[PDB]
Amino acid sequence: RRLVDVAQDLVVTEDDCGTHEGIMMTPVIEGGDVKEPLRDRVLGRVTAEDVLKPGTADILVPRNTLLHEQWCDLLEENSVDAVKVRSVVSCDTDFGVCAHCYGRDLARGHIINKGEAIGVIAAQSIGEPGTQLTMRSSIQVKNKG
């Protein structure tokens, strides 16, 4: 209820904002192995700046292209490390957010439709697994590198 009601005023009101800001998506490490690879962490989101492979000044992925399955598969074989992506927080749209700053609908294989309420979608997605939650040296290298 709290999640839905802090939301429900946020809908996709625009298609783009031309904002270069965003969040640098990096695979999360909490001391152990890769909990979530970058392939499954940036999938379906539109980048903010051109990603580059070890070769410098290389436009591997352009600035404002949605990262579908093909782009993510290309990212893995090019061995990318951190990809800057357009975050909904960084969006400067008033009374809503633009489609590019949000990304894939996560229910259809395309960019989010201009208008679709994503605040309620996000609130329900967060609150649904609430019933499935719970209530209560030295540094050693793991592999070659």
Partner 1 sequence: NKRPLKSLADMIKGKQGRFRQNLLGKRVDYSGRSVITVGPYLRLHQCGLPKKMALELFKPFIYGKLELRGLATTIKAAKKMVEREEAVVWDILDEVIREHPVLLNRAPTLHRLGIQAFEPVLIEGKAIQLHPLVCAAYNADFDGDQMAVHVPLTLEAQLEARALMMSTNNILSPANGEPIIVPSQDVVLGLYYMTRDCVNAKGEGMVLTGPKEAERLYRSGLASLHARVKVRITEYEKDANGELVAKTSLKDTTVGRAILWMIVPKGLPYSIVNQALGKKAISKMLNTCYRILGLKPTVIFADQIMYTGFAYAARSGAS
Partner 2 sequence: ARVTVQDAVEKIGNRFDLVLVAARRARQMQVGGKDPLVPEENDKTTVIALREIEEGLINNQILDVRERQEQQEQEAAEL
Per CB under 8 A, does 131 bind partner 1?
yes
Q: Answer with the entry of partner 2, partner 1, none that 39 interacts with (C-beta below 5 to 8 A by kind).
A: none
Per CB under 8 A, does 65 bind partner 1?
no
91 is in an annotated binding site: yes
Closest to partner 1 by CB, 17 vs 121, is: 121
Per CB under 8 A, does 113 bind partner 2?
yes
Per CB under 8 A, does 65 bind partner 2?
no
CB-based burial label for 120 (10 Å; 0-12, 13-18, 19+): middle
**Contact predicate 51/75, CB 8 Å:** yes
| Cα 36 from Cα 4, distance rounded (Å) | 27
Residues of each annotated binding site for Zn(2+): 17, 91, 98, 101
